[PDB]
Amino acid sequence: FVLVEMVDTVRIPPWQFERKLNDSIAEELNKKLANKVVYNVGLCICLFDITKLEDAYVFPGDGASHTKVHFRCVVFHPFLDEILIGKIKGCSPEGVHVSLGFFDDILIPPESLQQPAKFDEAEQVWVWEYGEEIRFRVVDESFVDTSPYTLVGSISEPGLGLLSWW
Amino acid sequence: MEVKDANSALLSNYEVFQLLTDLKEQRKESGKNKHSSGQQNLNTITYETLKYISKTPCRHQSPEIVREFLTALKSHKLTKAEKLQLLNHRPVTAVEIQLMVEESEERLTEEQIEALLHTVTS
Amino acid sequence: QGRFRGNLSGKRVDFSGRTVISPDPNLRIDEVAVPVHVAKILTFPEKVNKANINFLRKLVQNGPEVHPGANFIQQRHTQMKRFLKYGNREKMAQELKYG
Amino acid sequence: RCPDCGSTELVEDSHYSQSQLVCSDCGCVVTEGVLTTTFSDEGNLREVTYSRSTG
Amino acid sequence: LILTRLLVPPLCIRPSVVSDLKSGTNEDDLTMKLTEIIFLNDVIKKHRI
Amino acid sequence: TEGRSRDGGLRLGEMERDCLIGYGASMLLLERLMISSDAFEVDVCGQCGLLGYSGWCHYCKSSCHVSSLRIPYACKLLFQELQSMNIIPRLKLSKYN
Amino acid sequence: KEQFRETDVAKKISHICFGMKSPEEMRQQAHIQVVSKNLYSQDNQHAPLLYGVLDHRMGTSEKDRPCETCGKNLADCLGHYGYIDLELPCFHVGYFRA
Amino acid sequence: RITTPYMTKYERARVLGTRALQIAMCAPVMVELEGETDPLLIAMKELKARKIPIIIRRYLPDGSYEDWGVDELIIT
Amino acid sequence: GVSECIIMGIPMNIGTGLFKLLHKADRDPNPPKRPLIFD
Amino acid sequence: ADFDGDEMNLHLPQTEEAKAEALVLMGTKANLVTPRNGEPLIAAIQDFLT
Amino acid sequence: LPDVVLKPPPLFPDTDYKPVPLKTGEGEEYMLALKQELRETMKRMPYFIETPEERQDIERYSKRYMKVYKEEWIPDWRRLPREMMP
RNA sequence: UGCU
Ligand SMILES: *[C@@]1(O)[C@@H](COP(=O)(O)OP(=O)(O)OP(=O)(O)O)O[C@@H](n2cnc3c(=O)[nH]c(N)nc32)[C@@H]1O
Ligand SMILES: [Mg+2]
Numbered sequence A: 001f002v003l004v005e006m007v008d009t010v011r012i013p014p015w016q017f018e019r020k021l022n023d024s025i026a027e028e029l030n031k032k033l034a035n036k037v038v039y040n041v042g043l044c045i046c047l048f049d050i051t052k053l054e055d056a057y058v059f060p061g062d063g064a065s066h067t068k069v070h071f072r073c074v075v076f077h078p079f080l081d082e083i084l085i086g087k088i089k090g091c092s093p094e095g096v097h098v099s100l101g102f103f104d105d106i107l108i109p110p111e112s113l114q115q116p117a118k119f120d121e122a123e124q125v126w127v128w129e130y131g132e133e134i135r136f137r138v139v140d141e142s143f144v145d146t147s148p149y150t151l152v153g154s155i156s157e158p159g160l161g162l163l164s165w166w
Numbered sequence B: 001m002e003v004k005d006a007n008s009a010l011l012s013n014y015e016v017f018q019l020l021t022d023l024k025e026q027r028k029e030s031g032k033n034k035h036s037s038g039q040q041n042l043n044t045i046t047y048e049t050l051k052y053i054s055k056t057p058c059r060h061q062s063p064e065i066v067r068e069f070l071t072a073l074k075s076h077k078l079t080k081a082e083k084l085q086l087l088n089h090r091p092v093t094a095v096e097i098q099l100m101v102e103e104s105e106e107r108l109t110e111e112q113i114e115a116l117l118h119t120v121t122s
Numbered sequence C: 001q002g003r004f005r006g007n008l009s010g011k012r013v014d015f016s017g018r019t020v021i022s023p024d025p026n027l028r029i030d031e032v033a034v035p036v037h038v039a040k041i042l043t044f045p046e047k048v049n050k051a052n053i054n055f056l057r058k059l060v061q062n063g064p065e066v067h068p069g070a071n072f073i074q075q076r077h078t079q080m081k082r083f084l085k086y087g088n089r090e091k092m093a094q095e096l097k098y099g
Numbered sequence D: 001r002c003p004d005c006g007s008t009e010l011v012e013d014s015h016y017s018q019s020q021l022v023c024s025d026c027g028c029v030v031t032e033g034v035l036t037t038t039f040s041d042e043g044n045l046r047e048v049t050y051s052r053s054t055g
Numbered sequence E: 001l002i003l004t005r006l007l008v009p010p011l012c013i014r015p016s017v018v019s020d021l022k023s024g025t026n027e028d029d030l031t032m033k034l035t036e037i038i039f040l041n042d043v044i045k046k047h048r049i
Numbered sequence F: 001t002e003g004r005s006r007d008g009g010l011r012l013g014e015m016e017r018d019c020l021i022g023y024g025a026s027m028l029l030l031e032r033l034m035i036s037s038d039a040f041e042v043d044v045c046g047q048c049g050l051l052g053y054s055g056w057c058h059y060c061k062s063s064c065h066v067s068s069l070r071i072p073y074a075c076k077l078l079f080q081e082l083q084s085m086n087i088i089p090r091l092k093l094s095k096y097n
Numbered sequence G: 001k002e003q004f005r006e007t008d009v010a011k012k013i014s015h016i017c018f019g020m021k022s023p024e025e026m027r028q029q030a031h032i033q034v035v036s037k038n039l040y041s042q043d044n045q046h047a048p049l050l051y052g053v054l055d056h057r058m059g060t061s062e063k064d065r066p067c068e069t070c071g072k073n074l075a076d077c078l079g080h081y082g083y084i085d086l087e088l089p090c091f092h093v094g095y096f097r098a
Numbered sequence H: 001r002i003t004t005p006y007m008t009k010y011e012r013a014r015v016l017g018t019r020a021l022q023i024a025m026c027a028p029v030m031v032e033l034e035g036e037t038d039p040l041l042i043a044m045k046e047l048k049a050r051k052i053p054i055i056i057r058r059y060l061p062d063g064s065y066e067d068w069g070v071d072e073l074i075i076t
Numbered sequence I: 001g002v003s004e005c006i007i008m009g010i011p012m013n014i015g016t017g018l019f020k021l022l023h024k025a026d027r028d029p030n031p032p033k034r035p036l037i038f039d
Numbered sequence J: 001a002d003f004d005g006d007e008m009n010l011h012l013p014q015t016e017e018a019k020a021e022a023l024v025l026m027g028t029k030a031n032l033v034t035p036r037n038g039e040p041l042i043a044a045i046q047d048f049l050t
Numbered sequence K: 001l002p003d004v005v006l007k008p009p010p011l012f013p014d015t016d017y018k019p020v021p022l023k024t025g026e027g028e029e030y031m032l033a034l035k036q037e038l039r040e041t042m043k044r045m046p047y048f049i050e051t052p053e054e055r056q057d058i059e060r061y062s063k064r065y066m067k068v069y070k071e072e073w074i075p076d077w078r079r080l081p082r083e084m085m086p
Numbered sequence L: 001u002g003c004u
């Protein structure tokens, strides 16, 4: 979770003039940035606040009200060392499929660093014994439109001991 | 649609929880049928993030407690990431600070752990 | 007849007509007479609002045949035009949404 | 077929010098507008026979 | 400034009318000029060979 | 088209354009000469300034800087003819604000 | 899950920068190479030849035969250019004085 | 504050056109129209009543700008 | 220039296009900012 | 004009802004005088002066 | 008359003449080795200025451990004009 | 070729 500065030219139709301008801008920004991953930024959750809002222009075309609004929004973007607590939403032979609680099923922990008893035989077996912890390692983003996903990240689980659960 | 700074300022989970609660109450007070039908992903993401934060121990927090915890940790020369993780996790056991918290070497001192536990539990 | 003079500076448009003129002193200086035949062909796109909803409903009910009326309707959701000469004009008028 | 009702009653009816393939059941305009040439455009297109264009 | 490649425009600039009434079609002058240029290039290549 | 037999429309000649300019009805002149006559939406790449298709720039082999733009079809034809004549018009787009 | 990409922007042209293209830029811009001097095929359908003049990969000019580069009709096709190499260079009459 | 206080015919036409377009796009009316089915007539009534919520942003050639309200300007 | 404006299909700078219009919407410039507790 | 066979053109705008600009700027009641010298052109004519 | 060609010429037409092999000798080998050594040693030279990294994520205790350290040469400000002093 |  981190704040990000953005400047958006929001277009409000003429039938929304009876509503408050700031509330309409906030609603439009939320609807535009709800469940979308901005490249090199992360997945935006919602709008935090609006800092600067200059004059509202009306173009000779569509005739709506275009406003250039400066705002801050919350995005989920770890700092390459953040610790998280997720739940195992499945498991694959090459690696477990853990997912943060109802947030995103994109965490793919590589099983190449635990103690030398690591293997998945497709029977949803996590690990042989001697709320799942996660340590983010690196981020990565990719594009979608390439002809006429985008956030997976790397997860680590060192020898944390885990006296509560093996 | 360009961004100015993706790492402007880090915030704990309490601020996100408060923002989500405010958005949810404003939504339930001024719900609009067409606005909701246009984009339903907003409702889903807000509800699920709020449910996740409720599952976490982030409850029973207040800005006064956050400021007191920050001022208590300022005397421990700990870094911003460490204090952010401690505030977001609220560790009740010692092992969570001994091993799970990074940069343990030379920072634990085997005497400051008790003070850290007392401050995070108070 | 070049691109600059015959296709950019001066170009042909639609929704226009050419007809002979005749005198008529019974009309104001700021008024001009238009024949029914040209009026039924030259159409104007009017947006359905909370003011002229009933007028547009009556025009749709009249249809392309009667002079006060319309010829096509473009829905707000889909941009597929609908010809009033075919289909139930009464249903089309009863299902006129804003926009 | 009609994109709205799925009917196959598509008739080409020109409405005041406007060629238009329109459904006869609901009046949904399927296609409209045809691209012709113009006389000066027609005059400046030269007549070449298949004996030369084909090869 | 010295050209070695000619940019043949799309077919939108070169309208072609299929005159089914006879065994021929109406083509613009640009198509004929490009055909002549290609023929001359082929003839030059043949003479070089 | 030109003639009435071929269902032709009227021509707003250079004199009509001059009269409209003298009146100052900018929106009326725009609606007459762009919207109601040869309205079209093209795709222009913001990197090279060339004309794309279906939101794709074949020159740069990318589609991130391609954006839609309203332009007369006659103007697009003029741009294409100039590009054929090796006179390449490089369009540098920007926000309307 | 989903990436944020802007649908449409109210882009306004600022100015037109005229210029010229090198043969390499012409090759990069063009899609196919036109080498056949003929127009149509020997069959009675008189279909346009491939890699030749009047090819449908460089746009379309008929309401029945759509463009091959982009799967759109004539009303929606913008057209595509092509490059034709010359064995010997020639002076550009427009730029001969230059 | 240095330009002419009178509202020119070009400004009148542009404001009336913008208001008519907004009303045709289902904008709220602030004059309580009485059977006026023409958006241009409604815009003219609003202009005569001095209730159009539009502010003219006059730009000087150098780059400066000044805001003038419809109710603040003088009409003829 | 007016000629290139007409050619490109944009409103000419002369006439009604010399100035710009603004909407008199009920708003509040520089709205109150939510205070940051952690920072 | 002289009503001896003149063919005149009639155009219908397709935009509210264009309609308003035409009515205001190109209004007959507002263009009763020419900008050349201010003399009124829309006035009485034959069969009215007499 | 010239025949018509259906397909375009190959993008890389074949040639019956091949490049002459490179000169062999201890001199050429030593020159190659020295050029490789220069390539390897000039990148780490202080004159090889790299792109200044920016937009750091966070500050950590391991910053002092991972801090890149390299001696910087001092230019001759007597010979160099005054417009290049930091 | 006709029209004002
Ligand atoms: C008339 O006797 C001749 C003279 O025509 P031109 O003006 O010499 O034709 P042009 O020079 O080629 O004019 P443009 O360049 O404008 O096209 O030609 C016949 N004729 C010419 N034009 C017309 C016409 O418009 N309509 C008709 N019916 N006949 C025309 C005449 O016999
Ligand atoms: Mg006459």
Ligand SMILES: [Zn+2]
Binding pocket: D002, D003, D004, D005, D006, D007, D023, D024, D025, D026, D027, D028
């Ligand atoms: Zn149908």
Ligand SMILES: [Zn+2]
Binding pocket: F045, F046, F047, F048, F049, F050, F057, F059, F060, F061
């Ligand atoms: Zn490009």
Ligand SMILES: [Zn+2]
Binding pocket: G057, G058, G059, G060, G067, G068, G069, G070, G077, G078, G079, G080
């Ligand atoms: Zn195409």
